[PDB]
Amino acid sequence: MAFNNAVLQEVSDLPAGEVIKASPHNVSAFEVFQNGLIEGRFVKFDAGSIDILDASATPTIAGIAKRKVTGEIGPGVYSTSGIEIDQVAEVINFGFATVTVQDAAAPSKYDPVYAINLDSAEAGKATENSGATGALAVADCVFWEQKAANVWLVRMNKFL
Amino acid sequence: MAFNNAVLQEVSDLPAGEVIKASPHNVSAFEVFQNGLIEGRFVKFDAGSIDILDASATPTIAGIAKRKVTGEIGPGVYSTSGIEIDQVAEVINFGFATVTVQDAAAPSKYDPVYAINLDSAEAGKATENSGATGALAVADCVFWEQKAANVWLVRMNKFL
Amino acid sequence: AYSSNRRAMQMRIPTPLNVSSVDQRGFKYYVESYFGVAGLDVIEDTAGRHLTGL
Amino acid sequence: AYSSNRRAMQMRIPTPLNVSSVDQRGFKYYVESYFGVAGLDVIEDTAGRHLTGL
């Protein structure tokens, strides 16, 4: 159908899955990954492949799925075997990066980031509330500032 | 041995003590060291000097000893008092760096890096085997990818 | 009540009326004329509004 | 195995490929092409033979 949101009230800030390159930053390419890897989410590393967060024991959070500016137009999705095939999964593991947050979450600066660990659409979403279902403490990462609607720029103190 | 590997069916892959500059990296020069510091090996800071790991209990591990690419042809060794004299022991302490891996070690990506804290030539060699003898965890340091024969790119997440 | 701005909606007529050359079979002349239309391409949904049953 | 002698085997292509001019009616174009050709002229029945199953 027509273009969504003809006129927006404010200019939306950084979309999720984006890394600021003024600060020190590292986005590292993983060749093997999971089809349908949502961008702008925390992604885990399992069996030598970058895949979506899902209920597990203690997933190895490898960082934030980088949003490709020159990727396919559509939902933020990493795809294999299509016209929109993405050869590698670009993952932001160091620096300031934008991640979607649970719509219930209301975080603030220097709050410890919690990723979502569920087999649902909310997989890989950040949050401040640790009592949220499937709240996984991401090691050494803090919310920095609210960029967009339900998107927060967080800071990964060390590599993820 | 005379010019080992006369002909190779593939170009040799990255040697140890080599840090990739494409990412946030840091090699920091230490003006005093120990004679016989092996390049491409975990070094430790003790008594105000960089030196090869030995029988110590809880060494403060500086980082991978950087391989002086325009140093001496021969063993990758730091040396005082010679024509082969290196004034400063430049040491890689942040980012992706190549370290020699124990000949018996079979690591994989995101595997925590243990360094052999022994008094031998196997001192400072990286291994994934926690159960290996004389090895301590190099906290905040993971394996990234097998570069060369018994050489691995590891990731020092924080300033090591 | 709508907006006539080009960025709000357009009338896409991809192939404007073109008339075929006249065919003459003996003394029977015949022409076709086709035009290809996308139609009203409404660029943006809220660029108009309705009032039904006036 | 056959004989290529003109007194024993000939290929007869009287009319080559003759393609018509494109007839247009309205927007529909139609072209036709005829070629008149005789088959292989095997003048003598014994100018060849077959090995069936090699």
SS (H, E, C) chain B: CCCCCCCCCCCCCCCCCCECCCCCCEEEEECCECCCEECCCEEEEECCEEEECCCCCCCEEEEEECCCCCCCCCCCEECCCCCCCCCCEEEEEEEEEEEEECCCCCCCCCCEEEEECCCCCCCCCEECCCCCCCEEEEEEEEEEEEEECCEEEEEECCCC
Element containing residue C6 per DSSP (H, E): none
Nearest neighbour of A26 by CB, restricted to B24, B110, B140: B24
> Which SS3 state, helix, strand or coil, does residue D43 take?
coil
Best interface-test mutation with A: which of C12, C45, C49 has the largest number of A CBs within 10 A? C45
Q: What is the distance in angstroms between the Cα of A78 and the nearest Cα belonging to chain B?
A: 21
Among A118, A92, A72, residue whose Cα is nearest residue A14: A92
Among the residues of C1-54, which ranges form H helices? none
Polymer length in residues for chain D: 54
Instruction: Give D26's contacts in chain C (Cβ within 8 Å).
Output: 20, 23, 30-32
Experimental method: cryo-EM
| CA D41/CA D10 separation, integer angstroms | 5
> Which SS3 state, helix, strand or coil, does residue C47 take?
helix
A133-140: long-range contacts at Cβ-Cβ below 8 A with a sequence spacing of 24 or more? A134/A55, A136/A53, A136/A58, A136/A59, A136/A61, A137/A112, A138/A42, A138/A61, A138/A112, A138/A113, A138/A114, A139/A61
Q: Which D positions 11-30 lie with beta carbon below 8 A of chain C?
A: 24-27
| CA B74/CA A82 separation, integer angstroms | 50
Q: Judge whether C38 is closer than 8 Å to chain A, CB to CB.
A: no
Instruction: Give D25's contacts in chain C (Cβ within 8 Å).
Output: 23, 25, 30
